[PDB]
Design an enzyme around this catalytic site. Structure first.
Site, PDB file in Angstrom:
ATOM      1  N   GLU A 160       0.848  -1.194   0.000  1.00 54.77           N
ATOM      2  CA  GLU A 160       0.000   0.000   0.000  1.00 54.77           C
ATOM      3  C   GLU A 160       0.866   1.219   0.000  1.00 54.77           C
ATOM      4  O   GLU A 160       0.592   2.167  -0.703  1.00 54.77           O
ATOM      5  CB  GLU A 160      -1.016   0.034   1.166  1.00 54.77           C
ATOM      6  CG  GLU A 160      -0.553   0.865   2.384  1.00 54.77           C
ATOM      7  CD  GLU A 160      -1.690   1.216   3.287  1.00 54.77           C
ATOM      8  OE1 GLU A 160      -1.674   0.755   4.464  1.00 54.77           O
ATOM      9  OE2 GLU A 160      -2.627   1.887   2.807  1.00 54.77           O
ATOM     10  N   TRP A 214      -8.083  -2.303   0.493  1.00 56.58           N
ATOM     11  CA  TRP A 214      -8.903  -1.226  -0.082  1.00 56.58           C
ATOM     12  C   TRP A 214      -9.975  -1.739  -1.030  1.00 56.58           C
ATOM     13  O   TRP A 214     -10.567  -0.934  -1.770  1.00 56.58           O
ATOM     14  CB  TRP A 214      -8.050  -0.201  -0.844  1.00 56.58           C
ATOM     15  CG  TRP A 214      -7.305   0.819  -0.036  1.00 56.58           C
ATOM     16  CD1 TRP A 214      -6.052   0.690   0.493  1.00 56.58           C
ATOM     17  CD2 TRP A 214      -7.728   2.166   0.267  1.00 56.58           C
ATOM     18  NE1 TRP A 214      -5.676   1.858   1.133  1.00 56.58           N
ATOM     19  CE2 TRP A 214      -6.686   2.776   1.010  1.00 56.58           C
ATOM     20  CE3 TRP A 214      -8.892   2.909  -0.001  1.00 56.58           C
ATOM     21  CZ2 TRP A 214      -6.771   4.096   1.485  1.00 56.58           C
ATOM     22  CZ3 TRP A 214      -8.970   4.236   0.467  1.00 56.58           C
ATOM     23  CH2 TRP A 214      -7.911   4.807   1.202  1.00 56.58           C
ATOM     24  N   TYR A 228      -4.728   8.560  -1.153  1.00 53.77           N
ATOM     25  CA  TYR A 228      -3.431   9.192  -0.785  1.00 53.77           C
ATOM     26  C   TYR A 228      -2.430   9.351  -1.911  1.00 53.77           C
ATOM     27  O   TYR A 228      -1.559  10.217  -1.847  1.00 53.77           O
ATOM     28  CB  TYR A 228      -2.784   8.485   0.427  1.00 53.77           C
ATOM     29  CG  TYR A 228      -3.631   8.597   1.719  1.00 53.77           C
ATOM     30  CD1 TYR A 228      -3.798   9.806   2.356  1.00 53.77           C
ATOM     31  CD2 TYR A 228      -4.243   7.492   2.274  1.00 53.77           C
ATOM     32  CE1 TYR A 228      -4.554   9.915   3.503  1.00 53.77           C
ATOM     33  CE2 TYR A 228      -4.989   7.590   3.428  1.00 53.77           C
ATOM     34  CZ  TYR A 228      -5.149   8.816   4.039  1.00 53.77           C
ATOM     35  OH  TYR A 228      -5.892   8.931   5.195  1.00 53.77           O
ATOM     36  N   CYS A 282      -8.033  10.382   6.752  1.00 49.38           N
ATOM     37  CA  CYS A 282      -7.740  10.260   8.180  1.00 49.38           C
ATOM     38  C   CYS A 282      -6.376  10.758   8.547  1.00 49.38           C
ATOM     39  O   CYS A 282      -6.193  11.251   9.657  1.00 49.38           O
ATOM     40  CB  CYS A 282      -7.955   8.832   8.679  1.00 49.38           C
ATOM     41  SG  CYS A 282      -9.681   8.448   8.623  1.00 49.38           S
ATOM     42  N   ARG A 332      -6.404  12.975  12.128  1.00 48.31           N
ATOM     43  CA  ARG A 332      -7.681  13.518  12.557  1.00 48.31           C
ATOM     44  C   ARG A 332      -8.534  12.526  13.330  1.00 48.31           C
ATOM     45  O   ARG A 332      -9.309  12.923  14.194  1.00 48.31           O
ATOM     46  CB  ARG A 332      -8.441  14.089  11.352  1.00 48.31           C
ATOM     47  CG  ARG A 332      -8.991  13.056  10.494  1.00 48.31           C
ATOM     48  CD  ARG A 332      -9.995  13.604   9.471  1.00 48.31           C
ATOM     49  NE  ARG A 332     -11.205  12.837   9.660  1.00 48.31           N
ATOM     50  CZ  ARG A 332     -11.546  11.805   8.930  1.00 48.31           C
ATOM     51  NH1 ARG A 332     -10.800  11.437   7.908  1.00 48.31           N
ATOM     52  NH2 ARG A 332     -12.661  11.167   9.198  1.00 48.31           N
ATOM     53  N   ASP A 341      -8.921   4.747  14.650  1.00 45.33           N
ATOM     54  CA  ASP A 341      -9.428   3.515  15.187  1.00 45.33           C
ATOM     55  C   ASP A 341      -8.247   2.791  15.810  1.00 45.33           C
ATOM     56  O   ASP A 341      -7.431   2.188  15.114  1.00 45.33           O
ATOM     57  CB  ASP A 341     -10.054   2.707  14.054  1.00 45.33           C
ATOM     58  CG  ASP A 341     -10.539   1.348  14.507  1.00 45.33           C
ATOM     59  OD1 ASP A 341     -10.111   0.934  15.612  1.00 45.33           O
ATOM     60  OD2 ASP A 341     -11.336   0.717  13.760  1.00 45.33           O
TER      61      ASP A 341
HETATM   62  O1  LIG Z   1      -5.891   4.603   8.201  1.00 43.48           O
HETATM   63  C1  LIG Z   1      -7.001   4.658   8.780  1.00 43.48           C
HETATM   64  C2  LIG Z   1      -8.213   4.885   8.087  1.00 43.48           C
HETATM   65  C3  LIG Z   1      -9.423   4.939   8.816  1.00 43.48           C
HETATM   66  N1  LIG Z   1      -9.427   4.795  10.184  1.00 43.48           N
HETATM   67  C4  LIG Z   1     -10.687   4.809  10.974  1.00 43.48           C
HETATM   68  C5  LIG Z   1     -10.923   5.958  11.933  1.00 43.48           C
HETATM   69  C6  LIG Z   1     -12.430   5.908  12.087  1.00 43.48           C
HETATM   70  O2  LIG Z   1     -12.826   5.077  13.135  1.00 43.48           O
HETATM   71  C7  LIG Z   1     -12.967   5.222  10.847  1.00 43.48           C
HETATM   72  C8  LIG Z   1     -13.773   6.220   9.981  1.00 43.48           C
HETATM   73  O3  LIG Z   1     -13.296   7.571  10.146  1.00 43.48           O
HETATM   74  P1  LIG Z   1     -14.251   8.895  10.391  1.00 43.48           P
HETATM   75  O4  LIG Z   1     -14.385   9.621   9.048  1.00 43.48           O
HETATM   76  O5  LIG Z   1     -15.643   8.596  10.905  1.00 43.48           O
HETATM   77  O6  LIG Z   1     -13.508   9.746  11.388  1.00 43.48           O
HETATM   78  O7  LIG Z   1     -11.840   4.707  10.159  1.00 43.48           O
HETATM   79  C9  LIG Z   1      -8.232   4.574  10.825  1.00 43.48           C
HETATM   80  O8  LIG Z   1      -8.196   4.448  12.039  1.00 43.48           O
HETATM   81  N2  LIG Z   1      -7.039   4.523  10.152  1.00 43.48           N
HETATM   82  C1  LIG Z   2      -7.712  -5.578   5.814  1.00 37.72           C
HETATM   83  C2  LIG Z   2      -7.573  -4.910   7.163  1.00 37.72           C
HETATM   84  C3  LIG Z   2      -7.692  -5.649   8.352  1.00 37.72           C
HETATM   85  C4  LIG Z   2      -7.574  -5.018   9.605  1.00 37.72           C
HETATM   86  C5  LIG Z   2      -7.326  -3.633   9.764  1.00 37.72           C
HETATM   87  C6  LIG Z   2      -7.197  -2.824   8.635  1.00 37.72           C
HETATM   88  C7  LIG Z   2      -7.318  -3.442   7.288  1.00 37.72           C
HETATM   89  C8  LIG Z   2      -7.116  -2.268   6.405  1.00 37.72           C
HETATM   90  O1  LIG Z   2      -7.145  -2.339   5.132  1.00 37.72           O
HETATM   91  N1  LIG Z   2      -6.888  -1.139   7.064  1.00 37.72           N
HETATM   92  C9  LIG Z   2      -6.728   0.015   6.412  1.00 37.72           C
HETATM   93  C10 LIG Z   2      -5.520   0.665   6.152  1.00 37.72           C
HETATM   94  C11 LIG Z   2      -5.458   1.858   5.424  1.00 37.72           C
HETATM   95  N2  LIG Z   2      -6.576   2.416   4.944  1.00 37.72           N
HETATM   96  C12 LIG Z   2      -7.787   1.821   5.152  1.00 37.72           C
HETATM   97 CL1  LIG Z   2      -9.349   2.501   4.550  1.00 37.72          CL
HETATM   98  C13 LIG Z   2      -7.846   0.641   5.874  1.00 37.72           C
HETATM   99  C14 LIG Z   2      -6.945  -1.367   8.369  1.00 37.72           C
HETATM  100  O2  LIG Z   2      -6.777  -0.463   9.257  1.00 37.72           O
END
Ligand SMILES: O=c1ccn([C@H]2C[C@H](O)[C@@H](COP(=O)(O)O)O2)c(=O)[nH]1
Ligand SMILES: Cc1cccc2c1C(=O)N(c1ccnc(Cl)c1)C2=O
Ligand SMILES: O=c1ccn([C@H]2C[C@H](O)[C@@H](COP(=O)(O)O)O2)c(=O)[nH]1
Ligand SMILES: Cc1cccc2c1C(=O)N(c1ccnc(Cl)c1)C2=O
EC number: 2.1.1.45
Lengths: 303, 303
Positions: free
Chosen positions: A60, A82, A134, A186, A206, A209
């Site tokens: 990625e 993705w 990105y 994010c 911002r 999770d």
């Molecule tokens: O690289 C990433 C991409 C997404 N999220 C999480 C954060 C939020 O819990 C959820 C959706 O984001 P919000 O737009 O609701 O903040 O995905 C991550 O933690 N790391």
């Molecule tokens: C498959 C898997 C399983 C567990 C946790 C995660 C993913 C994943 O693609 N991502 C993730 C990384 C970067 N951007 C995004 Cl929308 C998601 C996770 O945080």
């Protein structure tokens, strides 16, 4: 240990976070504004206490470094991270025909879509191309004159010429697009920093999770700092992870206890000694030594 | 005390910072990535240990809130904070004719320029208008289609409708403009946060002059959080100040010791109980109670 700050932020949020509703409708425990540092000279901060597939992080990240926005490249590398969001430009479509055992015939239609992105150029071009993700923000930002800025590429020259500048900023936050855009980024912004031989990087994130996303995000940007020190011939200083809303999703409450009684072990990173154009790295130019994780913990990805 | 974090960051940088060259050619002691919190419910964080003219903070902030970019408004209020950079579109100009005792006849030509921005509309329009400065970024961001986004205005509606969103981001960082722009914005981005009645705000500040700039910047964005809680009818949580390069300029080394043996005293803030459209506040809608600062410390503004 190198990964303690991650373990401390799960502890903090669990013991001090305040119930918070969310876009998702899972609900969360959350804190606002928190920072962690990882001294990259001490080893690479891939979580030991739970498995984080580095194959996945680097494909990625290399997908980002190329300025690529098509699932296909990720597919050529077994990276399914993705898949979801490309599927929905097709899960909704006007070129679309097709349909519990959603748990199994969701897979059947996912395995279909993957397959023909993988092999049908026109489908790929229409459904595989994620768009404003990105890779475009980083190396092809859509100037107001219909042009395109290579933002990361531009800031790396500036690291090389003006290492001391406090302007070494790459952003992913485009106010013109964030109102109506699938995922406002994010990883809103990061900034490099050179002081006496050592490059550092700070990420403003911002929204985070903490169970599912953060283990990865730490590695993506820890990896990014190395790669950039490498190309500039710098040593590596710190990765600072700064958060807005750092949250535990409420269905992740079990898992994160599970993980918290694990006993951390820390891998080392090995960069091609004879390549420097990181926009031109493939997977064998990055190698992780002595990664020894505890196994994966099963977690419902909260909406 | 409420302002301890500021005193701690001056201490930290002084006792742990590493000499760093700078664009300016003053040189600095610097650290990368640091955070401070100020619990706004405990009083307003205007530094006591050294005087920070609040008249000045609020005129400039109201200049921002209106989407104004012309020195004139600041001039109507005896705010000389931004005089320098407007003067240079004239200090260089092709409508320009005119000229140690630079220390005194610099003032004579500054007092000239101020005067006719203050009274000659056409001059104002050409020399007073600073252009790409926080007022335009905040409430008139130049979309790629030649339009204009009211970014702050837009995010305040979102606080009101979707208080729980982690997307409540206003940015000042425009990659299309930062390459060739007088001051790439030091206040790169901020983000609001609502959890159970209390609005919080985090500022990402790419670059921070700790002696001269930070006392003000804390107040501008502490003030901003209040004003926004006020309009949304929220209580106030925290202001989190996050830094890239936080630095002491090397000629400020004396002054910051001077300041550090002062003994902190903390004012309270009073917002118009019957106005809410902050885009429509004048100076008497904001009042500071019981500000009791030690006096100003003389400091060479390092380039
Ligand atoms: O690289 C990433 C991409 C997404 N999220 C999480 C954060 C939020 O819990 C959820 C959706 O984001 P919000 O737009 O609701 O903040 O995905 C991550 O933690 N790391
Ligand atoms: C498959 C898997 C399983 C567990 C946790 C995660 C993913 C994943 O693609 N991502 C993730 C990384 C970067 N951007 C995004 Cl929308 C998601 C996770 O945080
Ligand atoms: O609100 C402000 C505006 C500017 N600066 C300082 C930080 C730097 O020392 C100097 C110039 O910034 P750089 O572009 O060199 O980072 O101005 C502040 O501290 N606060
Ligand atoms: C007059 C004075 C005196 C001492 C310190 C400061 C100023 C000032 O205008 N600012 C400032 C605030 C916001 N933006 C900028 Cl460019 C400067 C200072 O930090």
């Amino acid at each position: 240990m190198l990964e303690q700050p991650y373990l401390d932020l799960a502890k903090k949020v669990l013991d001090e976070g305040h119930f918070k509703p969310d876009r998702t409708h899972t609900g969360t425990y959350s804190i606002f504004g928190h920072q962690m540092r990882f001294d990259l000279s001490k080893g690479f901060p891939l979580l030991t206490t739970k498995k984080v597939p580095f194959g996945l992080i680097k494909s990625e990240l290399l997908w980002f470094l190329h300025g690529d926005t098509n699932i296909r490249f990720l597919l050529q590398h077994r990276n399914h991270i993705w898949d979801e969001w490309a599927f929905e430009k097709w899960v909704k479509s006007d070129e679309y025909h097709g349909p519990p055992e959603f748990a199994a015939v969701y897979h059947e239609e996912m395995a279909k879509f993957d397959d023909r992105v993988l092999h049908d150029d026109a489908f790929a071009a229409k459904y595989g191309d994620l768009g404003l993700v990105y890779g475009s923000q980083w190396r092809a930002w859509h100037t107001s004159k219909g042009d395109t800025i290579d933002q990361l590429g531009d800031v790396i020259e500036q690291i090389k010429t003006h290492p001391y500048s406090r302007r070494l900023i790459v952003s992913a936050w485009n106010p013109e697009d964030v109102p109506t855009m699938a995922l406002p980024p994010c990883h809103t912004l990061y900034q490099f920093y050179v002081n006496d031989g050592k490059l550092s990087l700070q990420l403003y994130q911002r929204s985070a999770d903490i169970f599912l996303g953060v283990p990865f995000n730490i590695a993506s940007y820890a990896l990014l700092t190395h790669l950039v020190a490498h190309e500039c011939g710098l040593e590596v200083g710190e990765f600072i992870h700064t958060f807005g809303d750092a949250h535990l999703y409420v269905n992740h409450l079990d898992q994160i206890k599970e993980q918290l009684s694990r006993t951390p072990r820390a891998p080392t990173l090995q960069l091609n000694p004879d390549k420097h154009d990181i926009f031109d790295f493939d997977m064998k130019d990055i190698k992780l030594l002595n990664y020894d994780p505890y196994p994966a913990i099963k977690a419902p990805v909260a909406v």
